[model samples]
Target: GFKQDIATLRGDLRTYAQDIFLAFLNKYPDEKRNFKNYVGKSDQELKSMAKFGDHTEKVFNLMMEVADRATDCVPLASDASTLVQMKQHSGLTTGNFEKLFVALVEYMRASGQSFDSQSWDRFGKNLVSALSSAGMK
Candidate 1:
């Protein structure tokens, strides 16, 4: 069930990205027009464009890196039963969770400058603060 939830969540996130893209196109027609100009680039040219700008390029690189990291880290549906078996014989600790999280971040860093310990800590702290303010339970 937990594994199923994970799969569902990933699908939902993909849907969310599509929705956001649509919303952005609807709200910013000029930006959409500019984006359309790059629709016919070759693979190498597209890669070049993804790294041509200091700010926008970095952002695009980060998004792609993170997406790849997520794909790498997601457990297979067949692994779900193993999770229960492993939990029965062992237990998850905060250190283990942190290690896994760090590994994923490290993988992203290897792919690009998408993650750093300082940035991760800063973002995590902000997320926690936001949740706390919203009365997370």
Candidate 2:
């Protein structure tokens, strides 16, 4: 279960938030322009700022809900409301969501948390499907 896997990592939420953003930037350099206003700041500094940290916390909370619902074998359709709400509120396109998903996977691997590849793939597929159904794609 993702719940158990995340529990094993025992990562601090703030550090996990930083790692997610850093990994995203490293993996997708072209996306840097999306955050060009933050160009001068280090990853840690960017993450430490109130607005950035607050946004990270929001994403973290959303993912936590996703992990919990998935662990319980809930249907992805059940997540549509949340997904739609986030999409509308955050202005995240389907591609941006996919990028974040990849970044999160990379962050988890970089953090040295062990988990089965199949499980991760299933989770990713489920999320993508949910997002697509919610018109994110």
lDDT of 1: 0.36
Cα lDDT tens digits, model 1, 1-137, are 32332333345444323333333334334443335644554434533553322333333243334323333234233332233244321543233323333443343344433334444433333333333343332
Query: What TM-score would each prediction reach against the true structure?
Result: 0.23, 0.76
Best by lDDT: 2
Candidate 2: Cα lDDT at 123? 72
Pairing residues by index, what is the TM-score of model 1? 0.23
Give candidate 2 regions above 4 Å deviation: 8-11, 32-37, 71-75, 87-90, 116-118
lDDT of 2 at 134: 71
Taken over the whole model, the C-alpha lDDT of each candidate is 0.36, 0.66
107: Cα error in model 2, Å: 2.2
Give the poorly placed runs of model 1, Cα more than 4 Å off.
Answer: 1-9, 37-137
